[PDB]
C-alpha cells in the first residue's frame, strides 16, 4: 500500500567451530603418541626382567 512491510528476520542454524586442517593435526598426534606409549610399555616390560 505504498508503505514498507518487511518479513524481517528468520532464524536457522546448527553449526560449530571447526578446521579440517586441524582434524588430522589431532589424528597424527594420536597416531604418534600411540606408537610411543605402546613402545614405552613393551620397552620397560622387557627391561623390567632384571634391575
Amino acid at each position: 500500500g505504498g508503505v514498507q512491510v518487511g518479513t524481517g528476520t528468520a532464524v536457522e542454524s546448527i553449526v560449530r567451530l571447526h578446521d579440517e586442517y586441524s582434524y588430522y593435526k589431532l589424528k597424527g598426534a594420536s597416531n604418534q603418541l600411540e606408537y610411543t606409549k605402546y613402545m614405552a610399555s613393551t620397552l620397560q616390560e622387557i627391561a623390567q626382567r632384571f634391575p
Binding site: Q48, R49, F50, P51
Partner: protein
C-alpha cells in the same frame, strides 16, 4: 687309624667311593643347603617380576 682313613661307600650310583663320612656329611648337607638359597635367589628373581 680308621679315624684318619678314607673308606668306600656302596651307593645308589653303584659306587664304592673311598671317603671320610665327614665329607659325606659335608657333601650331603652342603648340597641340601645349596638348593635353598638358589631357590630364594629365584624368589628374588621372581620379586623382580611379581611386584
Amino acid at each position: 687309624q680308621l679315624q684318619y682313613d678314607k673308606v668306600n661307600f656302596y651307593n645308589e650310583d653303584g659306587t664304592i667311593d673311598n671317603l671320610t663320612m665327614e665329607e659325606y656329611y659335608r657333601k650331603l648337607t652342603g648340597k641340601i643347603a645349596s638348593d635353598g638359597e638358589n631357590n630364594n635367589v629365584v624368589n628374588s628373581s621372581n620379586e623382580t617380576l611379581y611386584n
